[PDB]
Design an enzyme around this catalytic site. Structure first.
Site, short mmCIF file in Angstrom:
data_model
loop_
_atom_site.label_atom_id
_atom_site.label_comp_id
_atom_site.label_asym_id
_atom_site.label_seq_id
_atom_site.Cartn_x
_atom_site.Cartn_y
_atom_site.Cartn_z
N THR A 1 -4.60 -14.82 10.40
CA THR A 1 -3.28 -14.63 10.98
C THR A 1 -3.15 -15.54 12.20
O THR A 1 -4.12 -15.66 12.97
CB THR A 1 -3.12 -13.14 11.36
OG1 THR A 1 -3.22 -12.35 10.15
CG2 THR A 1 -1.76 -12.88 12.02
N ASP B 1 -7.91 -3.66 4.70
CA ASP B 1 -7.53 -5.01 4.24
C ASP B 1 -8.69 -5.99 4.27
O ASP B 1 -8.87 -6.76 5.23
CB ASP B 1 -6.30 -5.60 4.95
CG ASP B 1 -5.74 -6.82 4.22
OD1 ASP B 1 -6.39 -7.32 3.27
OD2 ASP B 1 -4.62 -7.26 4.57
N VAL C 1 0.86 -1.17 0.00
CA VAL C 1 0.00 0.00 0.00
C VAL C 1 0.90 1.23 0.00
O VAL C 1 1.78 1.36 0.86
CB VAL C 1 -0.93 -0.01 1.21
CG1 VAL C 1 -1.76 1.26 1.24
CG2 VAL C 1 -1.83 -1.24 1.18
N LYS D 1 -6.92 -7.77 13.37
CA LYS D 1 -5.67 -7.66 14.11
C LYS D 1 -5.29 -6.18 14.15
O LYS D 1 -5.71 -5.41 13.26
CB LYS D 1 -4.52 -8.47 13.45
CG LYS D 1 -4.27 -8.15 11.98
CD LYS D 1 -3.22 -9.07 11.39
CE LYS D 1 -3.10 -8.87 9.90
NZ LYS D 1 -2.21 -9.86 9.26
N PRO D 2 -4.46 -5.76 15.13
CA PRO D 2 -4.10 -4.33 15.22
C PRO D 2 -3.44 -3.75 13.98
O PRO D 2 -3.52 -2.54 13.74
CB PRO D 2 -3.21 -4.26 16.47
CG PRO D 2 -3.55 -5.45 17.27
CD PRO D 2 -3.96 -6.53 16.28
N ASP E 1 -9.84 -11.19 9.13
CA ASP E 1 -8.45 -10.80 9.35
C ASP E 1 -8.32 -9.69 10.39
O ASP E 1 -7.48 -8.79 10.26
CB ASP E 1 -7.73 -10.44 8.05
CG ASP E 1 -6.23 -10.62 8.14
OD1 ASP E 1 -5.71 -11.28 9.08
OD2 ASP E 1 -5.54 -10.06 7.27
N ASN F 1 -4.31 -4.06 11.02
CA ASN F 1 -5.36 -3.71 10.07
C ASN F 1 -6.31 -2.65 10.60
O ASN F 1 -7.30 -2.32 9.92
CB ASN F 1 -6.15 -4.96 9.60
CG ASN F 1 -5.36 -5.85 8.68
OD1 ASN F 1 -4.33 -5.45 8.15
ND2 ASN F 1 -5.84 -7.05 8.45
#
Ligand SMILES: Nc1ncnc2c1ncn2[C@@H]1O[C@H](COP(=O)(O)OP(=O)(O)O)[C@@H](O)[C@H]1O
Lengths: 18, 341
Positions: B192, B175, B48, B159-160, B157, B162
């Site tokens: 993950t 994401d 990105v 998680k921190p 997905d 994202n």
């Protein structure tokens, strides 16, 4: 301590998807 | 009645989503409309980049995928999912897709640039969040999953890494590479390691309850500073996840432990978010008793912090990455596979 064990581990950086 | 107002909100939001889901936007910009500045972050499938729109001067975050790599990694359908879903959703805590397009070599998704960095960076630096601060972030995810699940979408997905922090201190989820529209169960091994629910690891069919499990992992990690299941290698993580054992820091409140055990139930049929009352078991839990759900939605609650901002195009809240050239072949690659993109 559990914190110390985490900080010394190999997975403290950004984690990728499988 | 408050409950009827929520049902009406979700019914209208579904009508709005379905129109866009059935008639997706396509080909709404092109590469030479932008100057590429710097890489903001990476994932398993691509990168990105911060970009600047030449005509307006606005900055955006551009996800770039190499079509041949997507094909080689068997991610074609997942990438079509990502773009079709993200162009159709509209929620305060979901990043906005502004444009999308493709060329001979690559696929491009141009999002609003979220300048405050990943939650991940702030969480690692500060160590752990206080329970009120963790609760502020968690409430946004609860509402986001209520919205997504009502549209038959599973995110897969959390998680921190994202969860981006905006200039008001609120979350924007990025994401959507594993997001999928599904009624009933699915089977793909994706996510993950630290965040995988037991039913994914054990190669069972699974449903939206995997997102609620992942919320348990996230809240634990925010409040502890480390995940509930950690090790040096994924297989050791998986052994802990499936065991049914979880240990909590001595400082966790009674109500936090109670909520977390309910989200980290190894039997999906007993997991909060997946019982008869659905999301309301979470929203009505004692740990959330002080949360004003509408005020969170409307972004009227004072944030734990405002990220530092040094002007447009500043990336100081993000790590630096090695830069690679965005090349475009003279010959079209993988046209048939990506027709609908
Ligand atoms: N809209 C955005 N604004 C700023 N950074 C972003 C944005 N979306 C993704 N990123 C960064 O790119 C990383 C990879 O995200 P994903 O999508 O890639 P796979 C994130 O962890 C984050 O660092």
């Amino acid at each position: 301590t559990t914190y110390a064990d985490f900080i010394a581990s190999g997975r403290t950086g950004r984690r990728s998807a499988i | 009645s408050e409950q009827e107002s929520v049902k009406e909100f979700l019914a209208k939001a579904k009508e709005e989503f379905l129109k866009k889901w059935e008639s997706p936007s396509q080909n709404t910009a092109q590469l030479d409309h932008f100057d590429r500045i710097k890489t903001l972050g990476t994932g398993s499938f691509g990168r990105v980049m911060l970009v600047k729109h030449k005509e307006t001067g606005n900055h955006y975050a551009m996800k770039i995928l190499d079509k041949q790599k997507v094909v080689k990694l068997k991610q074609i359908e997942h990438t079509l999912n990502e773009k079709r879903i993200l162009q159709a959703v509209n929620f305060p805590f979901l990043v906005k897709l502004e444009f999308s397009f493709k060329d001979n070599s690559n696929l491009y998704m141009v999002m609003e640039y979220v300048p405050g960095g990943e939650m991940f960076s702030h969480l690692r630096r500060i160590g752990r969040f206080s329970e009120p601060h963790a609760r502020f972030y968690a409430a946004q995810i609860v509402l986001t999953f209520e919205y997504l699940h009502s549209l038959d979408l599973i995110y897969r997905d959390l998680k921190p890494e994202n969860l981006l922090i905006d200039q008001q201190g609120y979350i924007q989820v990025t994401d959507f590479g594993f997001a999928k529209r599904v009624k009933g169960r699915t089977w793909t091994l994706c996510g993950t390691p630290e965040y995988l629910a037991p039913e994914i690891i054990l190669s069972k069919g699974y449903n939206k309850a995997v997102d609620w499990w992942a919320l348990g992992v996230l809240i634990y990690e925010m409040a502890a500073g480390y995940p509930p299941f950690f090790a040096d290698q994924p297989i050791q993580i998986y052994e802990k996840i499936v065991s049914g054992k979880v240990r909590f820091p001595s400082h966790f409140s009674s109500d936090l432990k109670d909520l977390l055990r309910n989200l980290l139930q190894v039997d999906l049929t007993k997991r909060f978010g997946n019982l008869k009352n659905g999301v309301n078991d979470i929203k009505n839990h004692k740990w959330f008793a002080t949360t004003d759900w509408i005020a969170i939605y409307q972004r009227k609650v004072e944030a734990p912090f405002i990220p530092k901002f040094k002007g447009p195009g500043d990336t100081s809240n993000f790590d630096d990455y090695e830069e690679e050239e965005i090349r475009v072949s003279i010959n079209e690659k993988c046209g048939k596979e990506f027709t609908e993109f």
